[PDB]
C-alpha cells in the first residue's frame, strides 16, 4: 500500500530524514476515532501522491517516539516537512477538513511577502548615516525599493539585555523580494553569515517589527 | 420482497426500535402531511447510501397513535435518531438531504479523541477521603503507565440542603494507550464491595478545570 | 426544470387565483444579483416541490406586474399565500437566508403544526366566560386540547380601528389538529363561514398570536 | 421612575391604547432570567424615553393578562404599537439583543416619511387606467410627486376574502407629505371618509405595501 | 471591602456552606492576569451586592484547595452556589465579559418553563392506562394542565441497563408550574422520594425529552 | 484554454476587452500559496464555465502588468467584468471562499438600483434653474423619472478644491435606469465622455450622495 | 444661545464657508422625532463648544436648501467641515449615538493615510515611459516616495464607457502625504484642475485601487 | 496633565529607559483621528497612573523617531515596557478598546502557565535515557512534576540546519511553574545560560511545541 508502517527505531530515517512531506498518524487498534480516519488516510495518501507520504505509527507497538512530540490524545496527525513540524491536529476530522489542514500547510504560507528581513548583518555599533542608502542601493539590484528601517530590537526585558538590528527592505512586488532572498540568503559578508528571508507583511504594515 | 424501509407498529416499536442492532431513524409521519411528502424520497435515498450502518423506519401516528405521544412529538415530520435503545438525537420538521446527512454524521460520529483522563466513579466515599488517597491512588494507577496527576473531587448533588456528596477521583496518564489500560483492567470491578466505574473523561474539560461532568 | 415562467397576462391566474404558496422573482438576464441567487432558487423549487412554486417574473419583457407591487431594485421576492403577499424580500441573498425567510413565513414548509386558528368565529362583543370552555368542550372530539386562547386584535394603528377574535386551539398532536380543520373549515356559525386553518406553531410557542 | 407598573385592570388602557410603542414584560419575583433582564429594562426605558414607554406586569400579582397573549415562559417581550402586538421575545437576553430586537422595530418612527398612505378612498370597482394619473395630478398641488402606487391588497387566505385599495403617495421630501396630509386627512371624497397618513418610509423603499 | 478573604481552613465554611452565589478567584501576587482583573472585581462585588459575594483565595498562602478544583492556571474563577459549582472561567477577561458569565449563570436559565418533570416517583412496571389520568387530576390543583407526558429512558448503552420514567407536566403558565415545582419537589410518594424539577421549554418544544 | 494565459501584450485584448467576467491569478513558480489554489482554479474553471474564464499572469515572464494593478504579494486575485475592476482578493484561500468570493463580485451588489448617477456632464457654473427639468425631459424616454439631483461636491478639505456636479437621476423601477446607463454611459456631450452609472440605492435614500 | 439659524439665503455663507465644523439640523414644527432631538442639540451644542457649531435649517420656511443635499425625511442631520459633506444621519438618536457619529466623523477616518490619489491628471493617451519617473520626482519634493501606480479605470461596464487615469502616489509616512496634498489639491496643470487626496491605506495595502 | 511630550533627542532616554509600560502615540496637529484620540489620552493618563506613563511623538516636530519603528499612518501607538516593543495599534480607537488594548498588554498574558520550557540547557549530543528522569528530580524540588519533554527541534528546512533542544517541564499547578522559573532563568549550567520560561497551556495542551 500507499503507507508507510513505521517503528520507534525506523521514525528518524522515514520521518525526519524523508524528502518531501510526511503526514504521521499517532494511533491505535482499540481507538475508535483512530479507526474512523483510517479510510481517509488511505484516500488522501493517493489523492497526494507526489506531494504527500502517509504514515502511521501504532503507539502500542512503538511506545518511544509519541512522547518525544507531546502526544497526549489519539489520534493524533504530524505533518513533517524536511525534519520540521509544519502543523498538528489533535482527534478526528472530516475528509474535507483534514485537505484544508493539508493544503495550507503544505502551501507553507498564505501569501508571499514583498518584505524581507536582513538578520545578523549588522551590530548597533555599525549603525551610521550611511547604512540606509547603501541597502538601498544593493537591494536595488534585484528591483524597485519601497523602503528600508534599521531596526535596533532588545531581546528581554533585563537592563543588560542583547540588541539587535533588523533590517527590513520592502519591495514593490513579491517577484523582487523573491530574487532578493534568494541572492542573500546565507550569504558571507564581512564575516558574518546573513540569514535573508520574509517578513509577514501584514506585520509590517501595520508597523509591527517584532517578528 | 421486503422494504428497506420498516413500516413501525405500536407494538413492534420495542423490538424494531429499542431493541434493534445499530443506528435506528424514526420518522413520525401521516399521508395528509405536506412535509412528510418532501422528506419521503430523501428518507428512501438515506436508506440506501446508509446502508449497513443505519436502518430507516417510518410509524404513521394516524394508524398507531399510541407511540408518539410517549415522546412529545407534537408537530410531523419528527425524526428520532436511536441507538442501543437511547435517543441519541432528535429533528422536527422536513430538512435538506444535505442537511439530514449532517445531522446523521455528526450523531453517528461516536467520540473524536481518545483522553488521557480517566475518571473514578462510585469508588470512595467522602468519609473515606484522607491525606493518603491521593498517594494510594497514584500508586495503584502507576501499574498501567506515567500518572501526571490526580484529582479527588468532591461534588454536591443538588442545590438542596442535604444533598448527597459523591467522590469522583480524576486520574491524568501522560498519553492515552495508558488510559485505555486502566480503564480496561478497572470498569466494573468491586472493590472494598463497590462496583467502580472507570471511564474516559473529556480531556478538554479537564484541561479547563471543567469537573463537572 | 420546475420553476414557472409567467407573462403580465398570466399573472392574475398563475399567482393571485392560484391555490398554495407561489414565491415571485423579479428579475431581468442583465442583473448581477438576479443571476447569483438563479441556482439558489432551483434549489428550493426542488426541495419545496408540492408545498411551494417558485415562479420568475422577467420584468424587461413583462413591464406591467412589477410597479403594481412597488418594486424598485431587483431582484425582488415576493411570497403568496391565496392571493395575499404574506412577506417580501428585496435583493440576493443566501440559500440559508431564504430557508429563513420561507421558514418563517410559510411555517407548513417545516411541519403540520398542532395549533389549529378558528378566523371569522366570534364578534369581539359575543365573548363571555363561557366561551373557552366551550370551544375546549367543542374541540375535545377530535382529540385532548392542551390550550384555548381567546384573543382579541385590533387591525391597523388608527383609534377606531376594528377588533377581530382569533381563536386558537392548540391539541397534543398535529393529527387531532388535522382533523378538527378538516370538520370545521368552512362550517355555518351564527351567520358567518367559519375559517379554520393550521397556525405557525413555533410563533405559537413564542407568544406570537399576530399572523 | 420612567417604568410603567400595569395591573390586569389597567392594561388595556396603559397599553392597548397608548401613544407610541410599548414593550411589556411578563415577569415574577422568583423568576431568575426576569430578574437578569430588570436592570437592562431600566437602561433601555432611559435610552429610548420619548419613542418607547416600558411596562412590566407581574404575573402572580395580575394572572389575568398573561393568557390572553398565550404568555408561556417568563420572562416575555412584546412589543405593542398603536394596539397592535408588533413583536415577541422569550428568554432573557443581553443589553444588545434587546437594542437589535427594539432598533429592527421603530425605526421608521425616528424620522416623519416623505410616503403617504390613502386609506378607505376607492373600491377595487373603481380601479380604472385614469386613476393612477388623477392621483399624481390631484396630489402635485402639494408639491413634487416622486410616485404612486394603487395597490390592491387581499384580507386573508379564504377564497371570498375582501380586497381594500391603499394609494401610496411618495413625495419629494416629507414637509410636502405633510402638507398633503393635513389638507386631506378625515375629509370626504365620493362619500368616504379618507384615511390620510406617513406609511413607513423604510417598509415603502423596500417594498413593503402590507402595514 | 465587601471581598471575602479565604484560607484554606475557612474555605469550605465561607463558600460551599455559603448562602447566595459565591465567586470564587483563585489567584497569586506575581500573577500579571489576576492584578488586572482584581479592580474589576472590586466593581463586580459593588454593583452585585446582596446577589453574589466575591471571595479570593491566594495559591501561594493557601495551597490545599486550588488542586481539590483541578485549578491549573491563574487567575481561576469558580462560581459557587449552595456548594455546587455552577460554572468555571480560566483566565482573564474583560470586565464586559465577566458581566456576561456572571449574567448568565447567575440565572439559573434564559426562561423559566411551563415545564415540570418529575424524577424517581415511579418505577416503569408500574406504569398503567390511569397514570396520565392520575397525574392530570393531581397537577390540576396547581393550575391548567396543557399535556403529560409518560417517557421511559434507558441509561446507558448496556444490555441491562436501567431503565427510569420521567414524568413530564406542562402547564399553560411559567407561574403554575413554579406553583408545582413548590409542593411537590421532595415529597413522599409511595416508597419514594420525588424530585420535581423545572425541565427545558425549548427542549420539550421540541420533543428532546432527555434532559 | 477554459484556463487562459496571459502576456503583458495579450492582457489588454483577452482581460480588458473581455466579454463578461475573467478572474484574473497573479502568481510565481515558486509560489507555495499560489501552487495551492491552482486546483482550486481548476475547479471554479470547471464549475463557473459560461459564467467566468480564469486567466493566470506569471509575474516573472510578464513582469509589465501587475504594477499597474498595485499588485503587492502573490497570489493575488482581480476579478474583471467588462474590463471593469470588480475586485481583489489577496492571498491563497479555500474554495469555499473562493466561491463565496465570486458570487458576490460577479453579481457587483445585493440589488440593480432604481438611480443613476451622471458625472462629468455640467461645470457648477452651467448649473441654472432650467437644468433640473431639462435632465426629468431627457431622462423621461428612458422611463418613469421620480427625481433629480442637482449635486455639488467639493473635493476635499482645501482651500482650492475642485467643486464638480454630480447629476442624480431615480427612476420609478431598476429597468429604466439600466436603459437609461446603457443609453448614457460614454456618449459625448458638450465636448465630454459622459459618466452614467448605478448609484447604490441604500446611500441614496438616505441621503449619502457622497459616493 | 450657541445654535444658529440658517435660511436659504444664508446657508452658503454660514455652512459652506464657515470656519470650523457644522452640524446642520433639517427639521420643521410639526415634526415629533425633531422634537425629540431638539434638548440633545443643545446639550451637544454645549458640550462641543469650540469644536463644533450646531445649525438649524426649518423646511417649512427655507424649502429650497434640503433638496440640493438629496434630503427626504426628517430630522435629517449632516455635518460639514471645509465646505464638504463629511456624514449624513437620517432621523432621531440619543444623544449616545449622536456623539458617536460626531466624534468619529470630526477625525474624518480612523487613520492619516500616507497614500495620495491624483485625479483629472492625465488621460490614457497621456500615459508614456516617462510619466512613473515624472510623477516620482515632482512628489520626490514632499517626502519620500515608496511607489507610483499609473492606474487605468473603466467607468462602468458598457461598451463606450471612459478610461480615467488615477495616479496613486505612496510616501514613507503620513506628514509627507498631507504636504503633498495640501501643495497639489486644486492647482491648475496643463490646463486642468487636479485633485489631490487622500486614499484609504487598508484598500491599497490590499491591492484595491476602486475607490 | 501627567501626558509626556518626547522629542528626538529624549526619545530613548524618557521612553527606552523608562521605568514601567509607556504607552507611545505618534500624532501630528493635522490629523483628526490623532485629536480623536487625545482627549481620550488624558482619560488614561489619569486611570492608569502609577501604572502606565502616556507619552506623545509629534512626527512634524520631531521628525527623527517614527521611521525607526515603521511609522506609516497616524495616530500609532506603539506600548513599551523596559526597552521592548510589547505591543502596537494603528489608528483611532474608542476608550473602551484603548483599555482593552492596555489591559491585556500590561497584563503580559491571560493566564499563568503550568507549562515551563528550558531553552539553550542541552545539546541534541547530550541527550540520554537519563536525561528526563534528572529533569524531573531537579523540577521536583519547585513543585510537582506532571510530566516532562525533551523535545528536538530543527531550525529550518535546509540539509544541514541546526538541531536544538527545549525541555518542556509541566508542573500540577502554576505556583509551582512560577517558582522554578524565578530560581532558574538566567542561570549558568555547564557554561551555558539557560532560559527558562512561561510556555503557553493551549499550545502544550494541544501537543504544539513549536513556539
Ligand atoms: N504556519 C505558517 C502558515 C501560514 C498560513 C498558511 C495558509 C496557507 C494557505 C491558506 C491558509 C493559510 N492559513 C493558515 C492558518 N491560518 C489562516 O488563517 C490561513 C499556512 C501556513
Ligand atoms: N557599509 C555596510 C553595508 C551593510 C550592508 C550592505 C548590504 C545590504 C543589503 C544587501 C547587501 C549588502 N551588501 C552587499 C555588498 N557587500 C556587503 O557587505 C553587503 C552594504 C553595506
Ligand atoms: N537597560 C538599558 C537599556 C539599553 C538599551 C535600550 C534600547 C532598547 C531598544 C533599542 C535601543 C536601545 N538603546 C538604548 C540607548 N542606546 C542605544 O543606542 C540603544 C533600552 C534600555
Ligand atoms: N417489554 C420489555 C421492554 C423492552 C424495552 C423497554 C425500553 C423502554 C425504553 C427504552 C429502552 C428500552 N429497552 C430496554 C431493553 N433493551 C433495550 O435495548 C431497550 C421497556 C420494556
Ligand atoms: N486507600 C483506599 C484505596 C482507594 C482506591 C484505590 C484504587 C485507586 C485506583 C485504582 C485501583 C485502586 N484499588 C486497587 C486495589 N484495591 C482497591 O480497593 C482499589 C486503592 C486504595
Ligand atoms: N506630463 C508629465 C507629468 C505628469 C504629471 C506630473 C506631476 C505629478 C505629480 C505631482 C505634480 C506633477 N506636476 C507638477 C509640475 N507640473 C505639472 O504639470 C505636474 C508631472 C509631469
Ligand atoms: N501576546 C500575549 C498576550 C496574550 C493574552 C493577553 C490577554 C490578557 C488579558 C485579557 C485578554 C488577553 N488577550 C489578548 C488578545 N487575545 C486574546 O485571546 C486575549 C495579553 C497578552
Ligand atoms: N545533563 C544532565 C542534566 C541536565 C539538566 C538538569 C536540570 C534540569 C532542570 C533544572 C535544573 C537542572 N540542573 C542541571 C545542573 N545542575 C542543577 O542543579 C540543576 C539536570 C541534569
Same mark, same amino acid.
Given at each position: 500500500?500507499?503507507?508507510?508502517?513505521?517503528?520507534?527505531?525506523?521514525?528518524?530515517?522515514?520521518?525526519?530524514?524523508?524528502?518531501?512531506?510526511?503526514?504521521?498518524?499517532?494511533?491505535?487498534?482499540?481507538?475508535?476515532?483512530?479507526?474512523?480516519?483510517?479510510?481517509?488516510?488511505?484516500?488522501?495518501?493517493? &489523492?497526494?501522491?507526489?506531494?504527500?507520504?502517509?504514515?502511521?505509527?501504532?503507539?502500542?507497538?512503538?511506545?518511544?517516539? $509519541?512522547?518525544?512530540?507531546?502526544?497526549?490524545?489519539?489520534?493524533?496527525?504530524?505533518?513533517?516537512?524536511?525534519? &520540521?513540524?509544519?502543523?498538528?491536529?489533535?482527534?478526528?476530522?472530516?475528509?474535507?477538513?483534514?485537505?484544508?489542514?493539508?493544503?495550507?500547510?503544505?502551501?507553507?504560507?498564505?501569501?508571499?511577502?514583498?518584505?524581507?528581513?536582513?538578520?545578523?548583518?549588522?551590530?548597533?555599533?555599525?549603525?551610521?548615516?550611511?547604512?540606509?542608502?547603501?541597502?538601498?542601493? &544593493?537591494?536595488?539590484?534585484?528591483?524597485?525599493?519601497?523602503?528600508?528601517?534599521?531596526? #535596533?530590537?532588545? #531581546?528581554?526585558?533585563?537592563?543588560?539585555?542583547?540588541?539587535?538590528?533588523?533590517?527590513?527592505? &520592502?519591495?514593490?512586488?513579491?517577484?523582487?523580494?523573491?530574487?532578493?532572498? #534568494?541572492?542573500?540568503?546565507?550569504?558571507?559578508? $564581512?564575516?558574518?553569515?546573513?540569514? $535573508?528571508?520574509?517578513?509577514? #507583511?501584514?506585520?509590517?504594515?501595520?508597523?509591527?517589527?517584532?517578528?
Amino acid at each position: 500500500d500507499k503507507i508507510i508502517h513505521l517503528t520507534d527505531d525506523s521514525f528518524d530515517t522515514d520521518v525526519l530524514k524523508a524528502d518531501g512531506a510526511i503526514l504521521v498518524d499517532f494511533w491505535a487498534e482499540w481507538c475508535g476515532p483512530c479507526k474512523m480516519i483510517a479510510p481517509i488516510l488511505d484516500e488522501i495518501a493517493d &489523492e497526494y501522491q507526489g506531494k504527500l507520504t502517509v504514515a502511521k505509527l501504532n503507539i502500542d507497538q512503538n511506545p518511544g517516539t $509519541a512522547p518525544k512530540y507531546g502526544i497526549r490524545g489519539i489520534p493524533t496527525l504530524l505533518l513533517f516537512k524536511n525534519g &520540521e513540524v509544519a502543523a498538528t491536529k489533535v482527534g478526528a476530522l472530516s475528509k474535507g477538513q483534514l485537505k484544508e489542514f493539508l493544503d495550507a500547510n503544505l502551501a507553507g504560507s498564505a501569501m508571499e511577502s514583498t518584505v524581507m528581513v536582513l538578520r545578523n548583518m549588522v551590530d548597533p555599533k555599525d549603525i551610521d548615516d550611511d547604512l540606509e542608502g547603501e541597502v538601498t542601493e &544593493e537591494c536595488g539590484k534585484f528591483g524597485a525599493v519601497n523602503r528600508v528601517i534599521i531596526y #535596533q530590537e532588545k #531581546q528581554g526585558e533585563e537592563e543588560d539585555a542583547e540588541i539587535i538590528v533588523k533590517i527590513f527592505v &520592502e519591495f514593490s512586488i513579491a517577484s523582487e523580494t523573491h530574487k532578493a532572498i #534568494q541572492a542573500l540568503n546565507g550569504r558571507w559578508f $564581512a564575516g558574518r553569515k546573513v540569514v $535573508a528571508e520574509v517578513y509577514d #507583511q501584514e506585520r509590517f504594515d501595520n508597523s509591527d517589527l517584532s517578528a
